[PDB]
Amino acid sequence: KLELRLKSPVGAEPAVYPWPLPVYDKHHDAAHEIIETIRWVCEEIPDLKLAMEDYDTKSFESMQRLCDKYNRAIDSIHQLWKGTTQPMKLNTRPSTGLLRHILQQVYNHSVTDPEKLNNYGETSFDLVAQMIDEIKMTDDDLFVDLGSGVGQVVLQVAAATNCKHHYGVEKADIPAKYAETMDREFRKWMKWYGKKHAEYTLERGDFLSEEWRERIANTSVIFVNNFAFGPEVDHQLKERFANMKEGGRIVSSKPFAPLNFRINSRNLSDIGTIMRVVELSPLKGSVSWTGKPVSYYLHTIDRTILENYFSSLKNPKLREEQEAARRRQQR
Numbered sequence: 001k002l003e004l005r006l007k008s009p010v011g012a013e014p015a016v017y018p019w020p021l022p023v024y025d026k027h028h029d030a031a032h033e034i035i036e037t038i039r040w041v042c043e044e045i046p047d048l049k050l051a052m053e054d055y056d057t058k059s060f061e062s063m064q065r066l067c068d069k070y071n072r073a074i075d076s077i078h079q080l081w082k083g084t085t086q087p088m089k090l091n092t093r094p095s096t097g098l099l100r101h102i103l104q105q106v107y108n109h110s111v112t113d114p115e116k117l118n119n120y121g122e123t124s125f126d127l128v129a130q131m132i133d134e135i136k137m138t139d140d141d142l143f144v145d146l147g148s149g150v151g152q153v154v155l156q157v158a159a160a161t162n163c164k165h166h167y168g169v170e171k172a173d174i175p176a177k178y179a180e181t182m183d184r185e186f187r188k189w190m191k192w193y194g195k196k197h198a199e200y201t202l203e204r205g206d207f208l209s210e211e212w213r214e215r216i217a218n219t220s221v222i223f224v225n226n227f228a229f230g231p232e233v234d235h236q237l238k239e240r241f242a243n244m245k246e247g248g249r250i251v252s253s254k255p256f257a258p259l260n261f262r263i264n265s266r267n268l269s270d271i272g273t274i275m276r277v278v279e280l281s282p283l284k285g286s287v288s289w290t291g292k293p294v295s296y297y298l299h300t301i302d303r304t305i306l307e308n309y310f311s312s313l314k315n316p317k318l319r320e321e322q323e324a325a326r327r328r329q330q331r
């Protein structure tokens, strides 16, 4: 029983891999996970990168010499820390590049069958990363991913931001079950790298349920990939969003209200009356399964829109303007 071992840079339990090195799917195997782990820990620790400076991934001797060189380097770094040199971070967030590796790693050891996840740590990572950069979140924010799958988007945001809490709600059995493993693996691997994450919870359930009505209402930042949602589900969501607090934000792949929404007495009930909607900057060179560049939509709860409309009704000048417009429009 041959093995390959990688020591943790912060003294956690070693990562152990059986030889021959397992294959996860067509584009991921343990060999490259080992190589990627080594070189990301080198990015973590400059002295390590400085010492390390990796040939045949199908030779045991070649791979073992790679792991040995890494582990011996780690030992020297730990001795270096016992001296006058200050130890590593231990409370920092992972860089975007490292976080991508970690999530991929977590996915590799959680989802043993990527084939029964038949939908439509994927390469939405960069999309979500762009949103994390643009949508500012603080420690008073509550984050929710509506329909969170195996939970990778929640994990990514939780690793990146300092929201008070992050939630993922998932309805189906299989992804919710995998999410339990994703959760356990994530906490383990983040510790292995010595990286911090904000609080998060991956739950089972339906976000249309009566329980989630109040929960949505109290959420300050919602991510929902709703592009392929039918009109009934989207309508139900609009009803939920209507109870959100001022300044509450919804980021989605399909708008919940029109961008050029003009309020009148025919659309007084519509969600557009209480939110600003903008199309966010797309990420250069993206493209989705439809072959089009990905666009995102930011909704911000703002009830001054409605307030100002009601004020305008009290103004006789504005009133004539509105009423003359309506009659002209009906043509």
Ligand SMILES: CC(=O)NCCCCNc1ncnc2c1ncn2[C@@H]1O[C@H](CN(CCCNC(=O)Nc2ccc(C(C)(C)C)cc2)C(C)C)[C@@H](O)[C@H]1O
Pocket: 124, 127, 128, 131, 145, 146, 147, 148, 149, 150, 151, 153, 169, 170, 171, 172, 175, 205, 206, 207, 208, 223, 224, 225, 226, 228, 229, 230, 233, 251, 252, 253, 296
């Ligand atoms: C056709 C259809 O889906 N109808 C829905 C039925 C209504 C029931 N409501 C639901 N309640 C709870 N969970 C349900 C219900 N609907 C379905 N899910 C689950 O969503 C999961 C899929 N998710 C994605 C999972 C991973 N998370 C993400 O990709 N998140 C994410 C969010 C936002 C973005 C951007 C930044 C682009 C806006 C990007 C990614 C959907 C929403 C695309 C599946 O596992 C579904 O089981």
